[PDB]
Design an enzyme around this catalytic site. Structure first.
Site, PDB file in Angstrom:
ATOM      1  N   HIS A 131     -19.382 -39.543 107.491  1.00 40.67           N
ATOM      2  CA  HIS A 131     -19.876 -38.633 107.732  1.00 40.67           C
ATOM      3  C   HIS A 131     -18.340 -37.578 107.930  1.00 40.67           C
ATOM      4  O   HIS A 131     -17.173 -38.134 108.686  1.00 40.67           O
ATOM      5  CB  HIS A 131     -19.876 -39.191 109.503  1.00 40.67           C
ATOM      6  CG  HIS A 131     -21.024 -38.080 110.860  1.00 40.67           C
ATOM      7  ND1 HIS A 131     -20.401 -36.851 110.025  1.00 40.67           N
ATOM      8  CD2 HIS A 131     -21.543 -37.884 111.282  1.00 40.67           C
ATOM      9  CE1 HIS A 131     -20.762 -35.742 111.410  1.00 40.67           C
ATOM     10  NE2 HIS A 131     -21.459 -37.125 112.052  1.00 40.67           N
TER      11      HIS A 131
ATOM     12  N   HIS B 237     -26.037 -37.410  97.108  1.00 43.10           N
ATOM     13  CA  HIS B 237     -25.246 -38.181  96.613  1.00 43.10           C
ATOM     14  C   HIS B 237     -25.657 -39.848  96.376  1.00 43.10           C
ATOM     15  O   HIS B 237     -24.801 -40.627  96.755  1.00 43.10           O
ATOM     16  CB  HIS B 237     -24.164 -37.961  97.556  1.00 43.10           C
ATOM     17  CG  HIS B 237     -23.772 -36.544  96.848  1.00 43.10           C
ATOM     18  ND1 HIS B 237     -22.639 -36.550  96.946  1.00 43.10           N
ATOM     19  CD2 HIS B 237     -23.858 -35.235  97.690  1.00 43.10           C
ATOM     20  CE1 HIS B 237     -22.147 -35.188  96.500  1.00 43.10           C
ATOM     21  NE2 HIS B 237     -22.890 -34.728  97.661  1.00 43.10           N
TER      22      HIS B 237
ATOM     23  N   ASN C 211     -16.228 -32.528  97.389  1.00 38.64           N
ATOM     24  CA  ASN C 211     -16.748 -32.861  96.660  1.00 38.64           C
ATOM     25  C   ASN C 211     -15.310 -32.486  95.561  1.00 38.64           C
ATOM     26  O   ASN C 211     -14.242 -32.429  95.817  1.00 38.64           O
ATOM     27  CB  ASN C 211     -17.487 -31.987  96.231  1.00 38.64           C
ATOM     28  CG  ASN C 211     -18.589 -32.352  96.302  1.00 38.64           C
ATOM     29  OD1 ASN C 211     -19.326 -33.547  96.957  1.00 38.64           O
ATOM     30  ND2 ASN C 211     -19.724 -31.425  96.763  1.00 38.64           N
TER      31      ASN C 211
HETATM   32  C1  HEM Z   1     -19.175 -28.615 101.470  1.00 43.54           C
HETATM   33  C2  HEM Z   1     -20.346 -28.940 101.525  1.00 43.54           C
HETATM   34  C3  HEM Z   1     -20.360 -30.684 101.319  1.00 43.54           C
HETATM   35  C4  HEM Z   1     -20.029 -31.202 100.832  1.00 43.54           C
HETATM   36  C5  HEM Z   1     -18.882 -31.194 100.529  1.00 43.54           C
HETATM   37  C6  HEM Z   1     -21.023 -32.272 100.754  1.00 43.54           C
HETATM   38  C7  HEM Z   1     -20.425 -33.991 100.612  1.00 43.54           C
HETATM   39  C8  HEM Z   1     -21.190 -35.191 101.000  1.00 43.54           C
HETATM   40  C9  HEM Z   1     -21.226 -36.400  99.851  1.00 43.54           C
HETATM   41  C10 HEM Z   1     -19.401 -36.484  98.812  1.00 43.54           C
HETATM   42  C11 HEM Z   1     -22.244 -37.113 100.329  1.00 43.54           C
HETATM   43  C12 HEM Z   1     -22.019 -38.217  99.961  1.00 43.54           C
HETATM   44  C13 HEM Z   1     -21.306 -39.794 100.785  1.00 43.54           C
HETATM   45  C14 HEM Z   1     -21.467 -41.120 100.233  1.00 43.54           C
HETATM   46  O1  HEM Z   1     -20.754 -41.027  99.376  1.00 43.54           O
HETATM   47  O2  HEM Z   1     -21.965 -41.854 101.162  1.00 43.54           O
HETATM   48  C15 HEM Z   1     -22.788 -36.399 101.351  1.00 43.54           C
HETATM   49  C16 HEM Z   1     -24.050 -37.131 101.789  1.00 43.54           C
HETATM   50  C17 HEM Z   1     -24.968 -36.769 102.105  1.00 43.54           C
HETATM   51  N1  HEM Z   1     -24.517 -35.170 103.015  1.00 43.54           N
HETATM   52 FE1  HEM Z   1     -22.944 -33.671 102.345  1.00 43.54          FE
HETATM   53  N2  HEM Z   1     -21.843 -32.224 101.604  1.00 43.54           N
HETATM   54  C18 HEM Z   1     -21.615 -30.965 102.012  1.00 43.54           C
HETATM   55  C19 HEM Z   1     -23.089 -30.280 102.071  1.00 43.54           C
HETATM   56  C20 HEM Z   1     -24.186 -30.799 103.438  1.00 43.54           C
HETATM   57  C21 HEM Z   1     -24.551 -29.835 104.188  1.00 43.54           C
HETATM   58  C22 HEM Z   1     -25.025 -28.827 104.566  1.00 43.54           C
HETATM   59  C23 HEM Z   1     -25.648 -30.994 104.953  1.00 43.54           C
HETATM   60  C24 HEM Z   1     -26.576 -30.468 105.565  1.00 43.54           C
HETATM   61  C25 HEM Z   1     -26.676 -29.894 106.561  1.00 43.54           C
HETATM   62  C26 HEM Z   1     -25.163 -32.406 104.113  1.00 43.54           C
HETATM   63  C27 HEM Z   1     -26.643 -33.582 104.525  1.00 43.54           C
HETATM   64  C28 HEM Z   1     -25.984 -34.384 103.785  1.00 43.54           C
HETATM   65  C29 HEM Z   1     -26.886 -36.255 103.970  1.00 43.54           C
HETATM   66  C30 HEM Z   1     -27.666 -35.889 104.803  1.00 43.54           C
HETATM   67  C31 HEM Z   1     -26.138 -36.676 103.404  1.00 43.54           C
HETATM   68  C32 HEM Z   1     -26.374 -38.753 103.241  1.00 43.54           C
HETATM   69  C33 HEM Z   1     -25.841 -39.460 103.999  1.00 43.54           C
HETATM   70  C34 HEM Z   1     -25.604 -40.699 104.213  1.00 43.54           C
HETATM   71  O3  HEM Z   1     -27.122 -40.818 103.982  1.00 43.54           O
HETATM   72  O4  HEM Z   1     -25.101 -41.188 104.781  1.00 43.54           O
HETATM   73  N3  HEM Z   1     -24.560 -32.339 103.586  1.00 43.54           N
HETATM   74  N4  HEM Z   1     -22.822 -35.265 101.388  1.00 43.54           N
END
Ligand code: HEM
Ligand code: HEM
Lengths: 727, 727
Positions: A366, A102, A175
């Site tokens: 988060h 993202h 999402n």
């Molecule tokens: C239902 C499943 C998931 C959804 C809806 C989702 C949604 C998102 C969204 C919308 C962002 C961006 C937030 C922003 O705008 O800064 C993001 C970032 C991220 N996601 Fe998730 N994600 C999902 C699953 C996962 C999983 C399973 C992991 C790891 C175990 C993960 C790890 C991350 C990480 C590491 C970031 C970066 C955030 C940052 O650097 O602040 N995501 N995710």
């Protein structure tokens, strides 16, 4: 020297203006009167500039910011030039790691408020009073591409909302599709590595049309449901304002009595659901890779504020096991025909940020940031997410004090015994940095859980089982939800899904991967499987033709809420029309056109073969927004050609191609008077065609017709006519 | 599990193959026998995979990499799952800051060799013997966009070469134009901030068509020379293989006798100079944002190694002041008509990296990395660069030990008293960490300067003047070099320059900025200024019409070496042709076409309306590479349509548009037999036209004629005809 134009045209008016009317600007300068508690709290770090001296970061005024210090004017630069070294050092260290996923995203400020109190199902403070407003900051994003990738790629979109509540920050990190690709967080690195640019050469950037992605999908059938959504027109939204949002996981709501209710979160776009078509979306990644970012910013500058309704799907605790799918499986959706979405509140995004880096790039969301009244569940994807976000922000944001970066700060009180860390802003005066302590009489103190303003306590869910690394057997069904989605789409939506899979698998170099994916499609629906196979030159085997279709989902053979277009939800406010000018525009046509667009809040962009101005037949001077090539039909929702001196543009290649592209992409086209001669270029109909508005002059009825077409978004009946057109 | 296809078609053959024939792969697997000293020295850190057990980073074998550890198969995830936490932790921390500028780039390994010893003018070891081979690592890049931005944007390109010499690393960090935009490094942050995405909303990504860039340009006339080069077709190269390279600054060569000679560095492309046309380049950022990265990688896998000749412009110390311009001014070029480029050696790029992140993303180039035999000058832009690259790599690469990251390591010995720092790899055994010391007999020791293997000593240039922040008066001339560039271009190149300025200024929202840029153009050349003004609907004033043009440069009114196309240097090897198939192709035409292309090293891509295979007239099965929409005409250099059942594709919109797009972008098109029916699609006369090859069959001189057109790159005479054409 180098100064502003005498007339003051360098500065945008601080009032709502339509897209392209003024240069865009920082939110606090564009709409200084738009406020909320969070926006006001950022006043301590906002920095102006007008009438101030240029200085170093230590406050020393600079006399010459054009030259380094040297020994003679043609001499070597000296090490003692501290002004040069501070300026270059800061430049040299501007970049920070982009988000792992993202990384490409666009954000804005706004506010939320509930329609009524939800205290009967949750004690969450932000949902307790219809007149208690909560500031939000929202970021929309793509998944795969880097921060400098394109907006209108085919991808899942993120929709993250930070609520600054009175009892803590709540982040709803969702999402634009109701399910995720995988079941357990342990596979996230594998899935993400497979969709991202391949490791040897780092190609391709923001698209999933490559071998590794389809290899993973073919070997992990749990991904098929979200893959179906991505291949549909859901994967290419028209705007962040015209897509749905989902929390995906089942969470819990906890009321004052301690009762838990399972919940799934939804956002409904009040502008309606609308997507592009593939050819348009892909070409737009080249003509304007910043299309969604721009469109969001300009909608907020125009007063067309993105508005979304928060909705909840609620399932009583005793109904946990009553569906034919597990509620904790994130690859499964809960059909609205089974469990309706209850409306909860409205979110309005009404102000853009001041500085993209400070506020968007450094924002940290988060899903673990919950508040009293909310709780988690054992969904194995959500459980792993709880670890990951905190960990990644330590390196992305340089330390453990990322909550002190202005955009991330709570607006409510925060007090604890945590100290130090890189770039510590807070200066603690507490004599104690531990508890229990007698030396500060144990403050700050723990607070018992209660109905309101209580400490956080986890719902006491019963846990019974052995320590195992094992997937629940209940999650082992991968084809029924994909099929339910497929059958719920209109015929033209199904065609677009077929074309999405066909295009993507045609870019897979290893042919066996394409065949394996077609084999998986045959377990979903044979009509879908055969249509993709035919485009790939693949023949289904006799065994494949005999695969039994998966069972219905709790008796459903379709659910219309899964389609973008089955149930009309069009809204023209905020849309934009191109008006192709000529050098002697009939001002009576223009007058009628602009008046009817204005009444529905539809914007216009005046185009010509050159920039500058053109003069209408009555002397009105019309500034040109862009050329035909400069703002292609891809960027508008409809095209109108007024009468006047049509001979001026009748033989213009770009003007004719503008209509051919708009026609191919199913957009409404309206032609008045002599503009009807353009009907030959889009080589079709003589008596007229649904989708083409024509008349002797642009009037009330002509505009009503055009606006009715616009409310239906695109002219789906023209589909059969476009694959002959050379555009 | 054993998931590879039993036929072994998951793996690419380890032999040179044409673009698209096999899946691409890591360099060491694709070409294991292509070696050099640097490539061999990286063997200590290369990691394999086949036949090894999957482990944690601590070496513990993993049994189940599909699931997290939980209490019951539907229970909560446990904190004691160290396997999950290590895997997610590494994933969470994968990203590092991208380069502040030139973040988007593509690299390869190769070698360099001098044609003859240059011992008479320099003591540099790598230039001392024709049999001395020096390994190189080269990175090509754009300037503005992020690492995830598109390749075929309009921008200056970077051309950086790391030479792993026996006396140290020498980095030649150049661009594809002979001058830079600015004169003093103190303005680098200002210029870069002006070209990069605007700070409130972070738009636009990789293109300079926005207000702040043109605002800066309009207020800083020193930028006009490089702006002219960027607006020409130089800003949109066809490939990194077909552009020139320059060091820009005047450096010094120092020989064993201590004599200094001024030098400017050049790279000449042995594949010739070639660029795209704007519409094609912009559309290609959408159809394939990784086009240049892909093309470089595939050229190397095919054996079409990028080859460049290193050349020197040499000026004796006594001729420092004999030109109209200052040699130390980086906004001025040295015309080849005044000082010829002397050929020095050849560089061949013949192996791709294994891992893009490890080798490309972590590579660190710095113009301050010079070796004995070379020295700097007082050019004030160069002087500031010496500070900046060291500084930026501390944060980008996590500490002061970035020279220990494998790709950056010298191949020659390195020993000193520097210790510690983050990520320290070398374990020093020296008893001393200081000098002078007696405890290790003062080793390692300083080495006197000498003819070979001596210590570095700076040339004793006389410095004289007061400490001042002042631009030399000799740098205050901004329009004669831009005018010399303009007059050296062909008429079609001038039109493209006019179109570049016109398109870019049309995206500038504040009209006064457009007017100020037009006024600057009026100081360069009145024809140029009037043509841009016309496109902007701006009228030049009588004062602007009377501005006297700048003087010639040392009596020159043109220098043909500044044009891409004035002097033909076409090379067809490595180019690609689209072949539009039908369902009963005349095999005889195809045999003749493919063997003629193969004989000249020209690649082909067989295209159709679907994937799979088509059967020729004689039963030959023809494999399809891509569909018409999947591999658009933008990606090829010419289009050939063989005879056969032309009715099959005659009414296919995509097939007809393929020819219209190729025609508009000036590419050679060849039509055999009944494929001449497509002449009506592009409006070709019965008698034909230059640029269109047509005959009854593909035999005789049909292929020789098409290849002659390919050698000339594009059909410039068609410009007036494409003007119309709705494409
Ligand atoms: C239902 C499943 C998931 C959804 C809806 C989702 C949604 C998102 C969204 C919308 C962002 C961006 C937030 C922003 O705008 O800064 C993001 C970032 C991220 N996601 Fe998730 N994600 C999902 C699953 C996962 C999983 C399973 C992991 C790891 C175990 C993960 C790890 C991350 C990480 C590491 C970031 C970066 C955030 C940052 O650097 O602040 N995501 N995710
Ligand atoms: C003649 C003018 C210049 C040329 C030809 C030039 C060329 C380049 C190239 C080709 C790169 C990318 C190297 C790679 O591929 O990693 C680069 C990066 C860079 N340039 Fe320069 N540049 C110029 C001027 C400047 C100036 C005046 C400054 C600052 C005073 C500067 C600061 C940087 C920095 C900080 C980077 C990133 C290096 C890294 O992160 O490793 N450049 N430049």
């Amino acid at each position: 020297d180098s100064l502003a134009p005498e007339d003051g045209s360098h500065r945008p008016a601080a009032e709502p203006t339509p897209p392209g009317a003024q240069p865009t600007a920082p939110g606090s300068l564009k709409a200084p009167d738009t406020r909320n508690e969070k926006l006001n709290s950022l006043e301590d770090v906002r920095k102006g500039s007008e009438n101030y001296a240029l200085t170093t970061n230590q406050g020393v005024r600079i006399a010459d910011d054009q030259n380094s210090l040297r020994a003679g004017s043609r001499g070597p630069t000296l090490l003692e030039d501290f002004i040069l070294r501070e300026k270059i050092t800061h430049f040299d260290h501007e970049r920070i790691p982009e988000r792992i996923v993202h990384a490409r995203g666009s954000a804005a400020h706004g506010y939320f408020q509930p329609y009524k109190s939800l205290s009967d199902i949750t004690k969450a403070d932000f949902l307790s009073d219809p007149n208690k407003i909560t500031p939000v900051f929202v970021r929309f994003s793509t998944v795969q591409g880097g921060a400098g990738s394109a907006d209108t790629v085919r991808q899942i979109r993120g929709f993250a909302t930070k609520f600054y509540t009175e009892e803590g920050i709540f982040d709803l990190v969702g999402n634009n599709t109701p399910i995720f690709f995988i079941q357990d967080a342990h596979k996230f690195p594998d899935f993400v590595h497979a969709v991202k640019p391949e490791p040897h050469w780092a190609i391709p950037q923001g698209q999933s049309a490559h071998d590794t992605f389809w290899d993973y999908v073919s070997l992990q059938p749990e991904t098929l449901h979200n893959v179906m959504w991505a291949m549909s027109d859901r994967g290419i939204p028209r705007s962040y304002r015209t897509m749905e949002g989902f929390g995906i996981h089942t969470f819990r709501l906890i009321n004052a009595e301690g009762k838990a209710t399972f919940v799934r979160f939804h956002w409904k776009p009040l502008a309606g659901k609308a997507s592009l078509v593939w050819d348009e979306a892909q070409k737009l990644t080249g003509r304007d890779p910043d299309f969604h970012r721009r469109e969001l910013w300009e909608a907020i500058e125009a007063g067309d504020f993105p508005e979304y309704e928060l909705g909840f799907q609620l399932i009583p605790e005793e109904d946990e096991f009553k569906f034919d799918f597990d509620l904790l499986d994130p690859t499964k959706l809960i059909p609205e025909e089974l469990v309706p979405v209850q409306r909860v509140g409205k979110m309005v995004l009404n102000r853009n940020p001041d500085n993209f880096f400070a506020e968007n790039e450094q924002a940290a969301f988060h899903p673990g940031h919950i508040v009293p009244g909310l709780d988690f569940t054992n969904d194995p994807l959500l459980q792993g997410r709880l670890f990951s976000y905190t960990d990644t922000q330590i390196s992305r944001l340089g330390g453990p004090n990322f909550h002190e970066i202005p955009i991330n700060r709570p607006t409510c009180p925060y007090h604890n015994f945590q100290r130090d860390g890189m770039h510590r802003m807070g200066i603690d005066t507490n004599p104690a940095n531990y508890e229990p302590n007698s030396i500060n009489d144990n403050w700050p103190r723990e607070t018992p859980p209660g109905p309101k303003r209580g400490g956080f306590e986890s719902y006491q869910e019963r846990v019974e089982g052995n320590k195992v690394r094992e997937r629940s057997p209940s999650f082992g069904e991968y084809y029924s939800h994909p099929r339910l989605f497929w059958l719920s789409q209109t015929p033209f939506e199904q065609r677009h899904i077929v074309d999405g899979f066909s295009f993507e698998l045609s870019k897979v170099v290893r042919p066996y991967i394409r065949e394996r994916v077609v084999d998986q499609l045959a377990h979903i629906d044979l009509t879908l499987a055969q249509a993709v196979a035919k485009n790939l030159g693949i023949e289904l085997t006799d065994d494949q033709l005999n695969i039994t279709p998966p069972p219905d989902v709790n008796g459903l053979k379709k659910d219309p809420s899964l389609s973008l277009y089955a149930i009309p939800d069009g809204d023209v406010k905020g849309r934009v029309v191109a008006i192709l000018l000529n050098d002697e525009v009939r001002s009576a046509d223009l007058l009628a056109i602009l008046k009817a667009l204005k009444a529905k809040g539809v914007h216009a962009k005046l185009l010509y073969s050159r920039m500058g101005e053109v003069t209408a037949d009555d002397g009105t001077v019309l500034p040109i927004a862009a050329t035909f090539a400069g703002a292609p039909s891809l960027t508008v929702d409809a095209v109108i050609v007024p009468c006047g001196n049509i001979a001026d543009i009748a033989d213009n290649g770009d003007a004719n191609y503008y209509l051919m592209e708009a026609y191919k992409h199913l957009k409404p086209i309206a032609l008045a008077g002599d503009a009807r001669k353009f009907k030959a270029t889009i080589k079709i109909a003589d008596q007229g065609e649904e989708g083409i508005v024509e008349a002797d002059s642009a009037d009330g009825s002509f505009m009503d017709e055009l606006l009715t077409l616009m409310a239906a978004h695109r002219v789906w009946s023209r589909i059969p006519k476009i694959d002959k057109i050379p555009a």
